[PDB]
Structure 1
């Protein structure tokens, strides 16, 4: 029932969401971040943390993307957040690593389609 931030139809990305998934791919690390519309961040899964480093070969591969995808899936499940939104660019959406990361959301139980706001 909470109103979503509609508008911004002339700029990218749009802001009609409650919780958004942001994935940052740097030269050495890939950062998966989930945050609210207003700016507050709820949970994060970065390869910099030592917890997953002991078990992953590299922090900049598809294996790393699957590693943090399942980590984020378990973190979102235990944080109470089930619905989210993902707004990627055409090239990263076509990247093979990203699609398998979306597969982690499906097997993890995270849905990337926020329910529509009930106006009436």
Structure 2
């Protein structure tokens, strides 16, 4: 399984896709910003939030051993680091 994360100027999304192209599960900024009334502007805290969300949902769906492949340049950013931090904090094994 792979983790495709699209970071934008406003929100940031994280998608999990099966080999057939179908989405196993997804966690974005907007919907959970409507639900939890959390800050809608892109932040590392928000990334941690949706990271813990995606974590929980993947754990409830029984999704383990997920592959995360960020672009080589921005992979050193604090946001992605705390994304992998929030993901690993869920108890998953990369």
Do the two structures share a fold, i.e. TM-score over 0.5? yes
Q: Which has the higher contact order (CA 8 A, sep 6+)?
A: 2
1:107 aligns with 2:86: no
Q: Distance in 2 between matches of 1:44 and 1:27?
A: 19
1:100 match: secondary structure? helix
SS at match of 2:89: helix
Structure with the higher fraction of residues in helix conformation: 2
- 1:85-116 Cα offsets, whole Å, 9 max, x none, are 0111112211101011101121102223xxxx
Quote the Cα distance in structure 2 between the aligned partners of 1:74 and 1:109: 10
Q: Aligned-residue CA RMSD in angstroms?
A: 1.7
Larger Rg: 1
* Offset at residue 79 of structure 1 (A): 0.3
How has the CA–CA distance of structure 1 residues 27 and 108 changed in structure 2, closer, same or farther, with 3 Å as cutoff?
same
Q: 1:52 to 1:71 in 2, by over 3 A?
A: farther
What stretches of structure 2 of length at least 5 have no aligned partner?
Answer: none
Q: Aligned with 2:6: secondary structure?
A: strand
CA distance in 1, matches of 2:41, 2:12: 7
Q: How far apart are 1:51 and its partner, in Å?
A: 5.8
Superposition deviation, residue 38 in structure 1: 2.3
Following superposition, which runs of at least 4 residues in structure 1 exceed 4 angstroms of deviation?
50-53
TM-score where L is the length of structure 1? 0.71
Deviations 1:55-95 (A, max 9, x none): 42233110111010000110000001111101111122111
Aligned equivalents of 1:96 and 1:21: distance in 2? 18
3-state SS, counterpart of residue 42 of structure 1: strand
Structure-to-structure mapping, 1:1-120, within 5 angstroms: 19-50=1-32, 54-112=36-94
